[PDB]
Symmetry: D2
């Protein structure tokens, strides 16, 4: 949407990490205080966190912070470390039902306090976008592009273009003008914001590679697994090993949700593993699939319902057949 | 990329590992023109879907190249796409004193099917092997020749299936074949030496929020001599004491722990004090195969750790 | 089983068994006489092709135009305007390497064009190259030596080919329903002026002799030229004499957003030179007054510009 | 501590910096300040002579410039400056520094930082985290922050968390005292080849006022073989006019027209070719020497 510019918006900034130094730095930067910029309020988290140290509880914290302040602001910017920004953006998309205001995750590759920082520009753009292009999704702003949150990954560890959306175009691109792209809408509810709990869930993340043993699937099966993510080859292939397919069939028998993804940057799983109870994850990222599992396992649903929900497009994270 | 002489008719050996072909090729005139090298196809028995490959299969192919080395001018390895990058990476370490091209290629669509990329990937690989005899294990796909141990299958559904995220291509094909100025890998001299491999239990942990110290403990049970960590960004992992202790325990037991980025591109830069070795800008495919190579040698733990961070074959960018 | 007409205009198949496979549509090839290097094409050649499609329209399910790459984007662009109410796909394609030469891309672009025309029909003049289908009047030859020879700078492709073929969510062109209309053209003198440091009023003055009905300006950025008083006056003198003067960007991508406007100059939005030139040949060939032509140039007729 | 000279010539940009990691810098605001769309070749001269005056007293040079003709200026400076021993970096912004979301501050900060810490002794163009060879650039994207491209050459340097020099082959590079070549007005035409072009266009440029003609031809340098066209081109060369054939395409290399006197410009941009012509026409060289020099790699502008 191209939102109206008639009244001065108020944006809430959840400074999660990524004391008082940010807020003072922004005070000192005139760009942030111009007439064309929305008003904003910073909530600095205590303690501030390196995003590498994040757990699902942290997603919950942030979602509760949004719900607390929802009626009081026009939009939300989540300032976050880059390392797991994509996991947080993906988690929020599932947790937040009936979301009728923009939530934009952003941050920087270089600290605001350093030289050549991208923080100023990413945060300025996020605020301006949240105020003027109020897309009702959890999104991620980086390097002049706004992405669907649950479509992103950090693709480039050293680049300012750190984030990609390998299976979906950006929602918006910033140049001389801000351009909205033809990207199709996610499913949308109606009424007041509902936060669905995401709790800790033991989920294993198996990379498929030559020489991987059945012992891996057997080892996960011992306890730390209610779900298992397979990063398989290409369009979702794995070794045809009888013991391997046995241990997977066994897993699904014990009520473990086994989800097949591609280890590739882009592409779509096309489903043998299906006969072993494995569910296809279509073109979902690991970040979307991990958080979607956390979401569903923490909800009031049985194993069959979770399995079916995993291949369904819930929030724009997957492209239906 | 050397621009090799055209003056005489080359002979290329084709290892058809998997991924009827010979009859199809007999039936395609382009493969038999005067400008094309002569070629000889060894069809493997059985043919393999590359998804079913194990390190033993890398060994088999390396022995195949060694057996036929003196007899041909170059080698094209026809291979399934799913694990092409692991095979290409494995060969780069296993072959030392490589004085002839070895080019891995295949297709996203079968030669028999409609709209196949097989004809053009194989035609180009043969032509390149004959005329641009780069002495490395390379991977040809979709008009680019890549350093093998720099590749991954990045695009599951695209004809541009392979990328080389941390190194430009060695060569690009258009109206003209253009060799790029990518710096050369380290090179030995004399007859080809195959460094063999034997099975090595290696874990691949992905770092993701909520991952516990009980994960590293789990790998430390029976099936692990090395652990690869797919860490965040420039090599970051949870810094909680339980996690860092499990890692130090692992290294105290002689497990080689190597820190990579889970990101498509970039370079890894705490964990060090816990015995974790940085894998710089290496792919999982390079790192996994490098470990298979190094662990199969009679090398002490300290030597393997050191060698992991060293550029042995062009797979990493030194400081 | 679909049947595709192939116009081989210039820019063997029996010796390749893939083309005759059961999955392929039926196709017929008409070899043109003479066969032409696309560098040699005149606007009348666009007419010959348009009329050839017209003759064959009712009897085939789609159309493939085999064409040299040098001016393929001009032909695609022209056909888009000349064909109105198009109800079947017309796909222009070719090769960077001659079919007779090694490593040729000709066979695979043709097979793809045939397959796509049959199985994923899009009722527009399109250009297929290197696994992508582009809107014809958004194209240019951007890469003289590459197999990815063509780009569509201001519009995503309409379709992409991998293991599967995927239609993209690219916004449709304004599309008329009804009987196919084929608009003939007649020769029109049009000049193309590139804006560059040290350009003189003389250039614009020269075109104002006797050989010009329209002038295309390839100006800087979003449509700027030096503010030289003599230059501006020559441009005003151009429009006074009924010459249609259209401002484009010389840049590969972007949108003109304009003075020149005071001098009678019309903004061409994000139109390529190829779309602008052919659109001018189209409009000038009709029974339209100068003011109606000037208005229509800035309107989106066939998906060639973004309003 | 390094000291960088900044020539503020004008442009969009003008319509952390003093922190301890930054080099010292001095800004000279030109009078008048110019929209780069208004630039004439004599303005290249004023800039080259400004760099000449300040050369000895600074470690690097940053040229602040409008984007519309930045690539023409960068290209010109590369020919006019010979034996360059310090970095000259041209940059600017798509959004005025006064406007919101401006790229001005970050392009300038980067250009200053790069000139000081990663010096490359070439006329370069810095934009959107990349440093390009000046005479290989074009403004490719009118509306984008990634405004500039270098279609036939990779960038020389890229900035991320770290700044890295890339393995781009160096330009031919003279050692010795800096030589600054003045230029003088030269009438040059630029002809685009397109279907339905007439011999009259070439005939008109042969009216009185042209010393050179640049052809933007198809593909690898083709044009229609119209007898009248080919004859007018030949007449132009007979009159001593330098006719150079370029590709109208964004990338690639030019490879009867030759029989008509036309010189192949290889993979040179229009910007490089035009300015190279201004340079060579301004020196005291035979038409034949000029014709030969046009196809030679003088400053890294073409691939031999
Ligand atoms: N973010 C992603 O999931 C990228 C890729 N599919 C991976 O397995 O890591
Ligand atoms: N091939 C690769 O290693 C890509 C990426 N670094 C990953 O962890 O999967
Ligand atoms: N095809 C094009 O028109 C590209 C660009 N606008 C040019 O002036 O050449
Ligand atoms: N800068 C350039 O020269 C791009 C392209 N060769 C053109 O003719 O416009
Ligand atoms: N490791 C840091 C990187 C950063 O954002 O500065 C984080 O993601 O929290
Ligand atoms: N799964 C197949 C894919 C292919 O190459 O066709 C393989 O890797 O062998
Ligand atoms: N010069 C040729 C190039 C080709 O298409 O093969 C043409 O455009 O007609
Ligand atoms: Cl990176
Ligand atoms: Cl893909
Ligand atoms: Cl090219
Ligand atoms: Cl643009």
């Amino acid at each position: 949407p191209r939102g109206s510019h008639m009244q001065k918006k108020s944006i809430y900034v959840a400074y999660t990490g990524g004391s008082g130094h940010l807020q003072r730095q922004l005070a000192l930067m005139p760009e942030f205080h111009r007439p064309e910029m929305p008003d904003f309020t910073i909530h600095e988290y205590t303690p501030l966190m390196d995003s590498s140290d994040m757990t699902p509880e942290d997603w919950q914290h942030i979602a509760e912070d949004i719900k607390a302040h929802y009626d009081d602001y026009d939009g939300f910017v989540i300032l976050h470390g880059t390392d797991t920004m994509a996991y947080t953006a993906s988690a929020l998309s599932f947790m937040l039902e009936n979301l009728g205001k923009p939530v934009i995750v952003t941050g920087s590759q270089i600290p605001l306090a350093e030289l050549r920082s991208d923080g100023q520009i990413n945060l300025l753009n996020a605020l301006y976008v949240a105020a003027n292009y109020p897309i009702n999704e959890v999104t991620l702003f980086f390097n002049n592009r706004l992405y669907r949150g649950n479509r992103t990954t950090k693709a480039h560890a050293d680049g300012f273009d750190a984030f990609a959306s390998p299976n979906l175009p950006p929602l918006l691109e910033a140049g001389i003008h801000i351009r909205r792209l033809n990207t199709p809408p996610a499913p949308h509810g109606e009424g007041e914001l509902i936060v669905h709990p995401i709790t800790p869930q033991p989920i294993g993340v198996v990379t498929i590679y030559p020489g991987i043993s059945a012992d891996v699937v057997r080892n996960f099966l011992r306890q730390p697994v209610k779900a298992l993510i397979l990063r398989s080859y290409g369009v979702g292939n794995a070794p045809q090993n009888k013991a391997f397919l046995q241990e997977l069939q066994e897993a699904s028998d014990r009520g473990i949700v086994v989800v097949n993804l591609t280890q590739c940057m882009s592409g779509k799983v096309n489903m043998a593993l299906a006969h072993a109870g494995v569910i296809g994850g279509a073109d979902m990222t690991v970040e979307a699939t991990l958080t979607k599992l956390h979401y569903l396992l923490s909800q009031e649903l049985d194993t069959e319902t979770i399995r079916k929900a995993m291949s369904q497009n819930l929030r724009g994270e997957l492209t239906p057949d």
